[PDB]
Amino acid sequence: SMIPDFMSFTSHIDELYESAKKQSGGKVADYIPQLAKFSPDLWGVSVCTVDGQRHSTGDTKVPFCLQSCVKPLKYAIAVNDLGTEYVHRYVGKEPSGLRFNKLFLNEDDKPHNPMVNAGAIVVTSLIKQGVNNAEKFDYVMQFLNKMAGNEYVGFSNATFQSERESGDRNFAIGYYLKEKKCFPEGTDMVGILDFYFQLCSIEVTCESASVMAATLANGGFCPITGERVLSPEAVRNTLSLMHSCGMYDFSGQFAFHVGLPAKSGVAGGILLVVPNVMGMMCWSPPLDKMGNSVKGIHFCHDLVSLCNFHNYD
Amino acid sequence: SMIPDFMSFTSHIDELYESAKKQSGGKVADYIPQLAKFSPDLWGVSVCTVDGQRHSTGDTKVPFCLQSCVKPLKYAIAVNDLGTEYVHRYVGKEPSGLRFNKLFLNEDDKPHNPMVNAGAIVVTSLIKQGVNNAEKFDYVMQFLNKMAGNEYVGFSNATFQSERESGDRNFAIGYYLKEKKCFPEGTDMVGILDFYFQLCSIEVTCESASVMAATLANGGFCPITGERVLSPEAVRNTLSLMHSCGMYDFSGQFAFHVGLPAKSGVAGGILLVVPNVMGMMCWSPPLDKMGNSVKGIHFCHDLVSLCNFHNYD
Amino acid sequence: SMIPDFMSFTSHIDELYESAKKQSGGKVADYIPQLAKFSPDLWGVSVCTVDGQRHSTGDTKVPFCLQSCVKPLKYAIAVNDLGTEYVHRYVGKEPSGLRFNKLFLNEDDKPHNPMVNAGAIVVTSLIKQGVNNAEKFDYVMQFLNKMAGNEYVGFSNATFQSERESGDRNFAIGYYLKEKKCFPEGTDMVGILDFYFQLCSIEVTCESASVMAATLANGGFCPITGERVLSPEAVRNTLSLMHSCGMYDFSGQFAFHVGLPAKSGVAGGILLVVPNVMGMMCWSPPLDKMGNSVKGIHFCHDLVSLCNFHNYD
Amino acid sequence: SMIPDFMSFTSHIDELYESAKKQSGGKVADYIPQLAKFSPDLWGVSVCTVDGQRHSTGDTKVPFCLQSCVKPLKYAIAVNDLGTEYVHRYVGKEPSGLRFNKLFLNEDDKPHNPMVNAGAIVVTSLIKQGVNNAEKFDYVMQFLNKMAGNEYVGFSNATFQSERESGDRNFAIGYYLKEKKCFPEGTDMVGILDFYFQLCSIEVTCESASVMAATLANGGFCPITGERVLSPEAVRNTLSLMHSCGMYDFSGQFAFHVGLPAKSGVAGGILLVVPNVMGMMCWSPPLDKMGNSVKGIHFCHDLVSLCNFHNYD
Numbered sequence A, B, C, D: 001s002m003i004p005d006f007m008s009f010t011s012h013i014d015e016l017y018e019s020a021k022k023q024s025g026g027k028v029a030d031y032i033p034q035l036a037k038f039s040p041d042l043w044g045v046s047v048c049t050v051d052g053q054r055h056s057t058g059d060t061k062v063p064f065c066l067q068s069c070v071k072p073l074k075y076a077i078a079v080n081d082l083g084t085e086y087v088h089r090y091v092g093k094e095p096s097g098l099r100f101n102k103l104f105l106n107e108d109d110k111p112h113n114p115m116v117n118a119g120a121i122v123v124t125s126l127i128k129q130g131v132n133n134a135e136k137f138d139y140v141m142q143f144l145n146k147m148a149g150n151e152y153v154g155f156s157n158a159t160f161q162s163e164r165e166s167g168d169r170n171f172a173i174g175y176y177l178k179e180k181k182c183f184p185e186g187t188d189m190v191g192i193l194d195f196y197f198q199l200c201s202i203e204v205t206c207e208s209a210s211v212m213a214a215t216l217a218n219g220g221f222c223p224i225t226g227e228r229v230l231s232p233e234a235v236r237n238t239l240s241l242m243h244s245c246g247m248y249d250f251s252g253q254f255a256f257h258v259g260l261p262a263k264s265g266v267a268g269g270i271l272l273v274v275p276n277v278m279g280m281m282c283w284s285p286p287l288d289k290m291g292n293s294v295k296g297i298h299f300c301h302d303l304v305s306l307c308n309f310h311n312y313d
């Protein structure tokens, strides 16, 4: 309980929100129309404590796609159902670019970590094996519903259709992983890519996503339902990798100055977790060179400076 | 206070110690005679809580050189005296090998981080500039005395002499850094290398070093004297980088499975920090492929599994 | 005329052939059944001078697929029809792995050179644009007939079918090239890959292929028909790149010790050219670590030592 | 004899010279004062056929330092005296940057080739081992006198002094090579660097250097004295490597468009060899991004287009 008075803290959240609001730099992702449509002025921040206490400011009810923010979530599901040992038989745990800038695989022919595309694609192939794609999708949707305590969790068909149609790089990754036998025996690679595109197209709001983050911050228990959603093992692994691989090539500077587990997405979202304290979702479409939401990054740095939430504070 | 009963915990430390004792693999460093002399069976573990409570098992009073274990300590001193902004004007904060396996510098012509040789050499050039080497050395020795609450802090002249005489790679690094103007204006590169070799040759015991670690775990206050030795800023930065760059190329697997800030050295030492709980020093000469003490690594994994000290537990 | 007496030279060719015959190391390619079927003892060498004089020894009438040996040939066709400037607008001319080990593209997002798969795939997309694949294939077949002075030029449907079905890496390359807009406007990437697989599946004999090589050695004029098949520009460019990029990662050692333009293939063939003297085709299924025919490599080194054919002799 | 009439050819050389004279781009090297002093308008071209016929235009009698142009010459001396096998026991033959951009050594801990600094430094350590530096220097000076048929061969003490004083990168290379045991047993690395700096400081004129090149073009026999200076083996190896590694990172484009063995230097010189025809030395201080003389590069491209001297023409 580093927050003696929730109300006062709420008052500081609004100030930080207001401050980040002035930051207008960045560029809204436009590789597909569904992302290009978004207004650069959309900006929201939702908070959900381990207590179940809530607070939102800004555009917190406008749905947007998780995109890469879904990576830690599906990695968590895989570990929850299969265990650490099995999952990392197919994907690495290294946060570095070691000496593999852009390579789809490391020297052991394994994706570097679950937080980059090649790794997410492999993780996607491990979940609920043996059933059709429709059944796999429903399975993950239910899982996300629990993580979000039944709050907003939708799907963007337009994003899915455009993502699949212009995802040449992801298809290149898929064929290379097939080349190196990176998938479990009997995997339909193309079918796995569709499932991958679908997962990136799942929609949330800052409010529902903040609850998902709060669940990770609460050892795997949903703060607003009390249900155990993920195993302690799944949560710990997910946080470790979000800490070191969740903010693209900015992970290093982020880990040093912010020191919190987080995961960004091209839609402008930033899933932030403050272990044993709260979960958060910051969202603002304009992205910086690294691909991280400009307002989100600013807010995160300010939040840690003010409240001393850094893991090593 | 994750340790309700110190005595019971002490009892578990002995069991873990005993367990790691069976691990006999590894190779004692032998690039110089001063390291080759050490018996592979030397094994000690000292603990010093934020309280000031102590406990040792094994060879905890046999002096050994800090070697790379001194890197976070001198980085801490630099930040303490110069501030974060200035220090990182000369050295990076990236834990990755990004795409620089073995390179002495990153694309910006800066050492990757304070935890690799090139970075340590640059950091060494920033401390107490303007005075002779003898004065710089005395300054750091006093600083280490405070960190250790006046316990054992010596110096190995034989190691220093051999380190300097066979350190061709460090001299190559020194001339390259000079090439790229990596040092502050007016630096005597060769003189900086001597100071660097001297720092690596400083001796400690598991007992004194554990107190140094406890000081880092206690926000910069020495647990057995109550004195403020390092600024909060220095401690936080040091821990962040020990977490991501302190265990050579094993940092990734270490961060994932152990989740604690640590720094190893070729003498077989492992400076371990459990934020707000305790500081530790594990020592055993036999090193694994990565250059980390075999017994130390084993002990660290066991300690986290048993006591749930992982940052994200 | 470095060959005063053709008959005596013919006698030396048989000795070299006999010598290489003792070299039995290597492994027959087996990624597909059509290559795995081949006997490791098949060994033939055909020679065709700029004069039109012929000579064969060994298994010179057993058809085998050109595979990568077709790369310089189709590159020659492209330049012949489009000119140097246009072709290299899509592919590089660098023989080095510069700092791109295995990368499909260089820093300018262009395949390194026409002699590696990504480059061959792009070159394939430039030939006879606007017509259907069947028409493109017939066009190249006619071109090869001329180069071979109407001698054996067939097609292996089984190889084509297997190559396409197991070519995951080539499909990964195709999608990446599409990602980076490497193909001319309006290219059907998948359709280009089929054409690429078909070209690799074209069959020849040592005898017909030697004539193709002789055509390159004769400034673009077929030695046995007198017809101008390729422009002087096409021949010069092709030879330059065969010299520096035609023997996989062995190109460097090959260029130094043999000094002749050549191109190997996984079927065990080695298209060798001795400028203004003769063309040759060596064939033996067993390949070395680099992917080059063991007997072929041995024969090439011996040929240069004995007859002093090295470009700088 | 691709030059039926020397006089007419001489007339074309003047036209090409005049044409390149208009090219004024580039920057005179200025890392040391001795290079910075040179006027950007100095431009000369000397030719010396295998016959012994001469021709000069422009500033052909102004002395300038060989710098890197000396690399192939000292490599030739080493092979001449020690043989191919021994020399390449210490240095590679690969022209590529393979996957070693800037690295001082390849995966086998050997310099990539004799044409880059690390390789030149190692080659320098193999010549006339066992005698003092003064004796080694005199030995090479005599060798160069023979190669130049006793024409201008001097020494720049000022360049030597400045080269050694600011050569931090070369000293870094020297200590790294020592680290990896790259030198023959008992080598005084620092003493080798001085010898290396001295060799780079040897002076020539376009006229004397053209004779050195003519000697390489004439199988190792000096065109104006008839004496055998280098073994056939030494000449062939030197030309092979000049062809693939003599023009810095431009070697690839140079090999493709010019197709001649050449070696550039930071003083603006370009040692050009036309096998069995002539030797040439082009000189003009202004260098391009790659470090090659702008006028020299232009002249070389024009020379090949006009006279069809390309190895594969």
Ligand SMILES: N[C@@H](CCC(=O)O)C(=O)O
Pocket: A066, A067, A068, A069, A117, A163, A170, A200, A264, A265, A266, A267, A291
């Ligand atoms: N759908 C995008 C997401 C990118 C991102 O969120 O960073 C991809 O697969 O690359």
Ligand SMILES: N[C@@H](CCC(=O)O)C(=O)O
Pocket: B066, B067, B068, B069, B117, B163, B170, B200, B264, B265, B266, B267, B291
């Ligand atoms: N003196 C050694 C220390 C190595 C280590 O502790 O890892 C060096 O400078 O490389």
Ligand SMILES: N[C@@H](CCC(=O)O)C(=O)O
Pocket: C066, C067, C068, C069, C117, C163, C170, C200, C264, C265, C266, C267, C291
């Ligand atoms: N069809 C093979 C040919 C390989 C070779 O000839 O080297 C490929 O496309 O990789």
Ligand SMILES: N[C@@H](CCC(=O)O)C(=O)O
Pocket: D066, D067, D068, D069, D117, D163, D170, D200, D264, D265, D266, D267, D291
């Ligand atoms: N003395 C310079 C010569 C550079 C050059 O000629 O390219 C060096 O050793 O780097």
